[PDB]
Amino acid sequence: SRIVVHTRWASNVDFDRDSSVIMAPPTENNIHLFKQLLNTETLSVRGANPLMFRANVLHMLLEFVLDNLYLNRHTGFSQDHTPFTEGANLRSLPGPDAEKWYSIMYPTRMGTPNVSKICNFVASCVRNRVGRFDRAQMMNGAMSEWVDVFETSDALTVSIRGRWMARLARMNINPTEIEWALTECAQGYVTVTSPYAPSVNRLMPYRISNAERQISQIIRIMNIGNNATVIQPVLQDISVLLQRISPLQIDPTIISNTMSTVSESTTQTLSPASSILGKLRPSNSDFSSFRVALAGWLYNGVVTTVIDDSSYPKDGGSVTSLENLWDFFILALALPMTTDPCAPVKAFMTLANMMVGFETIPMDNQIYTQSRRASAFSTPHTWPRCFMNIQLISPIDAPILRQWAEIIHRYWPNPSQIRYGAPNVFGSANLFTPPEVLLLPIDHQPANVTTPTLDFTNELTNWRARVCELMKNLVDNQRYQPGWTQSLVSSMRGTLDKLKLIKSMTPMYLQQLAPVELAVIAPMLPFPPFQVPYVRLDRDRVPTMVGVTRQSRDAITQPALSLSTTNTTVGVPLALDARAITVALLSGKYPPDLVTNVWYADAIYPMYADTEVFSNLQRDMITCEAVQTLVTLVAQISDTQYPVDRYLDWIPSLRASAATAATFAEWVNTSLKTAFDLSDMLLEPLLSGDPRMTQLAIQYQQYNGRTFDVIPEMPGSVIADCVQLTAEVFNHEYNLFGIARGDIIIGRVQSTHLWSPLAPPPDLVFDRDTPGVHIFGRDCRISFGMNGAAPMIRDETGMMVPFEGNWIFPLALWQMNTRYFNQQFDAWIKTGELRIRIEMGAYPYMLHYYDPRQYANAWNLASAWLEEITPTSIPSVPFMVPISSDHDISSAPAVQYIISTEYNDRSLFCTNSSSPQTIAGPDKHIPVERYNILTNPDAPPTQIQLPEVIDLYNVVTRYAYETPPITAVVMGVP
Amino acid sequence: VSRIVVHTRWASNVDFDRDSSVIMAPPTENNIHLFKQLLNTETLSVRGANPLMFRANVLHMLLEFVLDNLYLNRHTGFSQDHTPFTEGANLRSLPGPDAEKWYSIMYPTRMGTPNVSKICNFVASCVRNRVGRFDRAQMMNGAMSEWVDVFETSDALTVSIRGRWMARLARMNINPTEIEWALTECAQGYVTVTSPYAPSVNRLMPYRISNAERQISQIIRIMNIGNNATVIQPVLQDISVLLQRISPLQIDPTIISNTMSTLSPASSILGKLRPSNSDFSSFRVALAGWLYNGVVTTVIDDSSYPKDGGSVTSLENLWDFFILALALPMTTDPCAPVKAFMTLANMMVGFETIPMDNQIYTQSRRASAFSTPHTWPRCFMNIQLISPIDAPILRQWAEIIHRYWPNPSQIRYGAPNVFGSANLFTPPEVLLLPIDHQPANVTTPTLDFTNELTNWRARVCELMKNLVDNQRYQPGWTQSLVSSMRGTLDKLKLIKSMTPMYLQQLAPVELAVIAPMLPFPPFQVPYVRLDRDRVPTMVGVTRQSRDAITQPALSLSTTNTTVGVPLALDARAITVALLSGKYPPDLVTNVWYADAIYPMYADTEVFSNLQRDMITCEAVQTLVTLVAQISDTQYPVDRYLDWIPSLRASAATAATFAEWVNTSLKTAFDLSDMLLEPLLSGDPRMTQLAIQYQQYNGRTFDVIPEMPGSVIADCVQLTAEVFNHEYNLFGIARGDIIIGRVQSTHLWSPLAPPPDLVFDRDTPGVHIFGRDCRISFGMNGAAPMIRDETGMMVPFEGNWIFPLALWQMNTRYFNQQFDAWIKTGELRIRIEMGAYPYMLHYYDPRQYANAWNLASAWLEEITPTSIPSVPFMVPISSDHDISSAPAVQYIISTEYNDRSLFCTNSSSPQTIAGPDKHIPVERYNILTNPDAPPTQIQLPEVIDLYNVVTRYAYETPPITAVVMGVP
């Protein structure tokens, strides 16, 4: 408000995030914020510090910028009937006293009381370059898509939103075109309801490139950096998603299956059912923790599916044993579920473990012994060479083992991939692979039937075949017999056959039905997952680490050398149990009820009510925009390490420090999060560490040393543009900001003339060129009184001089021993003729009017005002200003104390705007610097003419469109 | 009749003490005690004196008297009385009683002249106008000037002494203004002292000096230390005391406990810490290490090391290397970084493989065993050698070292403007710090990434976890504790200590404030972190004189690690302080430290250091000076009492003397705490010291001191020369003696024998005798006769010549041989003595008992290393004649003299019998001819014993104030 530049004036307000930038009351002091923004070395309802005086100001500017992204929706107009107008349209609004908002928006409705300079200029203006001019109206019954008109405001805001819109609309299309990519995410099988139409000016700004894609990735990649407690719950969220999809029945299923599939060994040394009953659980209740590994699949170079410890027995392995058989079966089943590349070697060593003491062949070291925990082995180098070096396996001592190893060699599941979605609109999916390439630990097979059926065609069914074969090969052993009974082994095979031939709709749904159902979500992932190309063999591909730079090295400002230094943990262990796994594999129980097209798309749509990707896309976009705006500002006033255009340093503000930088960046991040009430990790990982040497990229390397760079890139910040523009323009309007260029001259002067100390008559100032200069830099001590001499200052050479004259002082010396200085100077500047140019550069000030008719003192303990300040900063300058008359007024004294070293008096809200003359009131004339147009039609309104031409009543384009929420146009078909 | 009381220190105007024996030894009493209180150590009785040290002792002798007189003068009131002989005089009123008797003592015309007496008669010639108060200073306190000359009995000796004294003193006074300015700088702007008052010009602040003095003092201090720990350990003690006494920050390991929420890591550390400890000192001492470097080295035990070995699988070793790795970088031992590097390597030896550069070196060898610049490996000096497959872990580690390693700084300190500051390997006001500092207002939470300390915790947590992750560098590790251990690493990396803040910006302040308070200033070394060749190697000094080709004094720099005394610390307490840190819960920096400061600086002791050092340098100055006056050194010397025979010098001579001085002055200042070990830190015949220090490169930096004058030896020359023109005055005479039995009734003293009963040495009737001259005995018991240089056998009589070599070595024989011959017959031998003590024997001219008894005694009491002062039976002059004496002379001086003959007939106004002596009215010439001023030219001529003597009302205040600390 007055001087009204602040928002909430007449516009179509829609919602705020507290970008509160405003003014302060002008008839008195004026700070508008800075007893609330930054008071680092000052403290008051009336203070600010010049040792952080560049952050605060920018910050103030930036929030201002933020305040102005609101939705323009112009509604209706009408020709007018004042004598004042000759057809200029009024904007018709239902608002109360729209008339005042017009007499305000336009100088209209301003009558003919008596001859006033105002009224005179009124009678002279134009009847045309006023009100409506033009618009983009090609439709019927609905407003122009935008309307231009001559109304009062600052066209930055106009151009501001021009660039705002530019950033927005750039991503629109004919909508239904996106029904493609949705159907591609619908897999073509989640049928879709939506209208049929091309672009109808309903902006759908979600056509996005891979730049911001990858950038947001990076951000997540350290946002996820070292926090995996959070990954578990949402993984369960996915598990329940699947629960809402999977038809399985668990407890009595396996109950009947097991009571049917085992063979009789009750009087035959540990009956298998009894043992296995006591092992599994009759724990009949909700059990759904199976979906775990399935959902975890979404990450491989990200997470490491490891198996729980107790899943393995703790006996070093042996032959004559039944629980060995149980558990070895279980693991042979579950290991092909793991992501760990040593899992082959792991099971290898595992069978070696139960092969402790009977079959014994080449052993490499004291760890590759068959007595060592397989899971403990970690590195390619931790893998028994012989495992990968099959010829060390003599088929003589380990015939069965060589057998089985070769089985695994030729027989082992393999990876595949699948597609989803569209970079066409939405950029990459992962960055260490081509777009939408979704590699798979499995090799999906095409399902055809819409209902479950029995069949044994599956790589894992084949594996089960292999393992039952090996088991029968072994249990019948002649070393078993002495440890056992013989009809026992008969019943053993009697079990294993029904085992390998047990009922299970699992593997078919897995190999065929699961994969598409995985693809069902499956960008609809709050965190977009990541994965890395697969590895089945050939240790040389075993990755090393994903090093991420977001800065440089200590002594090396280059990224390409700090690469080894700026690098972060990779992979996490996540231990799982095989029980429910085998439970499911050996028993799939699916009713013929999931009518895929019907069932699944049915299960989905109601869930589809608030599609997050919308929030995700905007999230990431604004994210990267912020990040860019940052990487720019850190190089400006606020240098980082590379001197490029700093602008305001003619303002003295203290130099760069990460501490100061971190402070400012906090203010930023704050404002940012507000901008849409953002609430998640945001640049929080960047001030985590120094965002001063910022250099972004990432890489991963493998056992073959093969390195793989990914280097991000950002297209800039529309904000940063506008803000720099305005910043430059500012340099000449500083007056409008309660901060002044120059210094002040201080000594008790006594005048009655009506003159601003903001522009005092020439006679009153002095300089170095002035004689009487007592020049002081940074050597000034002070003696108290002497024998006959008063307190005398030790001089810059070291001499003692009394306190009066023309003296010069650079501020820092002052801020040093302020207290000393102040306790001394009281009289001899107040009463004495001590006058110093204390030299500040650029500084806050403040004011109060006053009636000149009485005497005026500009002491009023302005000293007291001073001493209130710290030895660390300076108090804003209050001023008493007379009410000068346009003509006669009587004489009264005025004892001033402080004056501006310059003329800078330019700031005023209107006072006495109705008269060609007034007795003594604020001498004010219509500010004729913005409406010269109203006397002559010129000044290309939209052409860039600032600061060369700055007005406040301009080209005005209130918009009007069709603004549907995109969550709403999400109509599903079940 | 009596003689003159040549004295001082008999009318003390003060209670100050010197303990400097200004007694003169009387003649009715004994005399040679003053000649048996010198460097002589072989004396045993009332009587006797060594010939060979005669000259050699006089120095100290005359010196001590001087040491009596630097006392301080004060006001005296105003007396106004007049009597006929005292008409119109402003006598100096004295608060003391019988001061009028003391006036007659100082006022001659005080007494009158009503009759006949050498007093009455000559005082009848004395005026009343050159008596009493002469002239005054307009500068004056009470009833006396700050300098007021007044006619009075006095010795110009004391005058000159205190005059040059005063000169020095006032040459030092300091303005309270610049004083408080100092105190400000001393307080670094954290004192508050003003002074609006009524001025007083008596006030005295004489303490302004240069730097060379303190620098010398620091040198000698180190020398006396001679590398003794017990010297400076208690220094560190006082330090830690005041430190723990002053720091508001609080430590609480129990915090972590809750942070951990009480092996499992927690159990391990809980056993590691003993949750009972209550004492907090040696850590503070680890800090105070940063204050002195040039002599000491912070080191660490290896009981903290994993046997200085370690492995890659011992969880305890994890704890310990963790612990240390944190507690290290703050040390001063320069081999630290590569040492921790190599220790880490040793524990790791076997998984990662790196080239070496010495077979005796071992990648598993002891870091302790590697403690030289030569223990540096060029692979640690070039990482590019480390292929990232050799040991990438260690490569990254070495780079971490190259990068985050601590980095020194400095600050201003001291008040060199007036008192100066002593620093040689650095400018005086420069104060290093092995780390870097930052500005104030830490009243914000203590979190700081940019803190090299948080930096440290961060980087170490990283490298640790990074390594621990693989499970394979650590085989045998089965249960997944990547959860427990690594989350623990997180929690600890997330433990907040306010200590690092104190360290980063507060400790700098504390120590900068301590700096001026040092009764012993620092001694440190230019800190570096790299370039072994730059690494210092030598801290040498030359306890030997420089004027000859002279290697410096042996230094331990080649046997210690670099230069410094070892110092092993506790990693536990240190790293805990690094770990748990909390400031007072309501703290406001300044007011806290204001109150913490006040009473401390309310006390002050550095002025003791000043007095110490100034006296020290003056003392050694005049010391080596007098050395240049005693005998021959490696430079031309000038002796002056060589007219008093004594040989050239040995060392223990001055040694005795040196400690004479040390004792004397310590007793003279009641600062009996020892100051100097002159040769006990120096060398019998040295002239100068000089320091030097060099790096491993061979870059040497070699400093030499400078000398100012010392008026002491000057005034010594002053005094002696006057005595060396006015002799006898104190018990020693030049000349010789003639020995033989002559008798007379014409009365005189053997000091004034007529030159008739005398003969020149080697007179006609000559009888020369060398060392080898042996006797021809008489025949059948006849008179033996002695062989001549020609051979002739002459009897025991004539004029005989013994310069001296043999009588020294053949005393008692000679006595027994020549006794009766001198006793009853002529045997006139001249014996050569040069300068020598004498004695008297009071006797009446009317009676006699044999002096030859006591004479023979004095003979018996001589050794070649000892001579007693010769007694002489002294008669009574009279105002009336009496029965003369046949007096039997045996031995007599060879000369006429006056030592102190004042005046005959102590109170008898006239004298007839015996000699006469009037008053040396000579000395009071202004009292005879007042044409003369007091600075008239009469020196080194006759001394006057009456003067106008400036007396003073200046005042020295004990240096204090009323102030406040950090506001």
Residue numbers in the entry:
A (entry chain A): 302 to 1275
B (entry chain B): 301 to 562, 571 to 1275
Anything the authors wrote about it?
The particles harbour 10-separate genome segments and comprise two principle protein layers, the innermost composed of 120 copies of protein λ1 clamped together by 150 copies of σ2 (viral polymerases, λ3, are attached inside adjacent to the icosahedral fivefold axes). The outer layer consists of 600 copies each of μ1 and σ3. Here we demonstrate that vitrification of infected cells followed by cryo-focussed ion beam (cryo-FIB) milling and cryo-electron tomography (cryo-ET) allows high resolution reconstruction of assembly intermediates of a mammalian reovirus, allowing atomic models to be constructed which throw light on some of these fundamental questions.
Unexpectedly, numerous star shaped particles were observed in the virus factories in addition to particles consistent with the expected virion architecture. For stars, analysis focused on the fivefold regions using emClarity16 yielded a reconstruction at 6.6 Å. Broad features of the organisation of the molecules parallel the arrangement seen in the virus—five copies of λ1 (termed A molecules) cluster around each fivefold axis and five further copies of λ1 (termed B), orientated in a similar fashion to the A molecules, are located 35 Å further from the fivefold. Since the 60 copies each of the A and B molecules account for the large majority of the density for these particles we henceforth term them single-layered particles (SLPs). The maximum diameter of the SLPs is very similar to the corresponding layer of virion-like particles, however whilst the latter are roughly spherical the SLP is collapsed inwards at the icosahedral fivefolds by 100 Å, to give the characteristic star shaped cross-section. There are also significant conformational changes within the molecules, the largest being a hinge-like flexing of two parts of the subunit (the same hinge is used to adjust between the A and B conformations in the virus particles). The molecules rotate by some 35° and slide partially over each other like the blades of a camera iris. Overall the λ1 protein structure allows it to occupy two radically different configurations in the SLP/virion-like particle, but is likely not compatible with stable intermediate structures. The interior volume of the SLP is 59% of that of the virion-like particle, thus the dsRNA genome segments cannot fit inside (the dsRNA in the core of the Reoviridae is already at a concentration of ~410 mg/ml5).
